[PDB]
Design an enzyme around this catalytic site. Structure first.
Site, mmCIF file in Angstrom:
data_model
loop_
_atom_site.group_PDB
_atom_site.id
_atom_site.type_symbol
_atom_site.label_atom_id
_atom_site.label_comp_id
_atom_site.label_asym_id
_atom_site.label_seq_id
_atom_site.Cartn_x
_atom_site.Cartn_y
_atom_site.Cartn_z
ATOM 1 N N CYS A 21 0.838 -1.218 0.000
ATOM 2 C CA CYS A 21 0.000 0.000 0.000
ATOM 3 C C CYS A 21 0.868 1.261 0.000
ATOM 4 C CB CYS A 21 -1.028 0.020 1.123
ATOM 5 S SG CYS A 21 -0.359 -0.095 2.820
ATOM 6 N N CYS B 128 -1.702 3.698 1.199
ATOM 7 C CA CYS B 128 -1.282 4.080 2.579
ATOM 8 C C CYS B 128 0.030 4.836 2.563
ATOM 9 C CB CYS B 128 -1.188 2.853 3.492
ATOM 10 S SG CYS B 128 0.291 1.862 3.182
#
Ligand code: ROJ
Ligand code: K
EC number: 3.2.2.-
Length: 255
Positions: free
Chosen positions: A74, A156
């Site tokens: 991520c 992320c």
């Protein structure tokens, strides 16, 4: 009255192209080797065959999304708005980072067109709906909104985005990037969005991080409780050369 659509028809050999891309991708990515490419094709075709191509929904693509489920690291995501080819060139040289077209489902669909018709089980090779001239809920547009919302949701840590510094709106708040992707960056996962503003060759080394639409992006990101960073890429050719060989004496450390 409707005798055809306004857009180009389905890519010639679309079925072969989707199946072949699935086989090639699952060869190159042993982490997706569990996939059955024929099942993936059947799920893809089932999203749009025998359906009016202005009535397509995200639920139509749920079987395909399920079969093409993929976990992407991520903190290795590169998003893009209106500058896909440089983003792809970048991940060809920075091989641990991913654009959407480096995922199985994005790889399958990249640069293709497809649609069907309500009356029959046939793929329409004559014409397909254009998003603006005919209808927004067309098979291609709905696919990309579905899969890119999941890609943005999953990102992320530090997320990067490439933008075209030659366009009148370097960041267009109503683009697909500005609607679907920006508003699906989750503050519980994402620390920073860092924009790479690619100079075109007519921006005279101006600081495009001060452009009004970049200030707009910064404000939207700040309101989602995410930090914003911006970097000018003055020379996209030299940037790629330096990503490939970080010790080359032409390299800056601006990025
Ligand atoms: C999330 O947003 C990215 C594209 O954002 P953008 O600002 O460049 O989009 P746009 O110009 O407003 O709309 C472009 C339109 O093109 C479709 N599309 C996306 N990716 C592809 C690929 N790889 N091939 C062909 N067509 C594509 C989509 O329907 C967009 O709405 C992008 O990375 C995802 Cl969609
Ligand atoms: K945050």
């Amino acid at each position: 009255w409707r005798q055809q659509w306004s857009g180009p028809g389905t890519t010639k050999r679309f079925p072969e192209t989707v199946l072949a891309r699935c086989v090639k991708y699952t060869e190159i990515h042993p982490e997706m080797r569990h996939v059955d490419c024929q099942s993936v094709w059947d799920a893809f075709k089932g999203a749009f065959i025998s359906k009016h191509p202005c009535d397509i929904t995200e639920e139509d693509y749920q079987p395909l999304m399920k079969l093409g489920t993929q976990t992407v690291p991520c903190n290795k995501i590169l998003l893009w708005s209106r500058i896909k080819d440089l983003a792809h060139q970048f991940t060809q040289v920075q091989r641990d980072m991913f654009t959407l077209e480096d995922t199985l489902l994005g790889y399958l669909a990249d640069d293709l067109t497809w649609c069907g018709e309500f009356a029959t089980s046939k793929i329409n090779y004559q014409s397909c709906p254009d998003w603006r001239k005919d209808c927004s809920n067309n098979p291609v547009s709905v696919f990309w909104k579905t899969v890119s919302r999941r890609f943005a949701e999953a990102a992320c840590d530090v997320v990067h985005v490439m933008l075209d510094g030659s366009r009148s709106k370097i960041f267009d708040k109503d683009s697909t990037f500005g609607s679907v992707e920006v508003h699906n960056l989750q503050p519980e996962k994402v620390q920073t969005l860092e924009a790479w503003v690619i100079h075109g060759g007519r921006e005279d080394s101006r600081d495009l991080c001060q452009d009004p639409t970049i200030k707009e992006l910064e404000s939207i990101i700040s309101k989602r409780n995410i930090q914003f960073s911006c970097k000018n890429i003055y020379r996209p050719d030299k940037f790629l050369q330096c990503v490939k060989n970080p010790e080359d004496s032409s390299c800056t450390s601006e990025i």
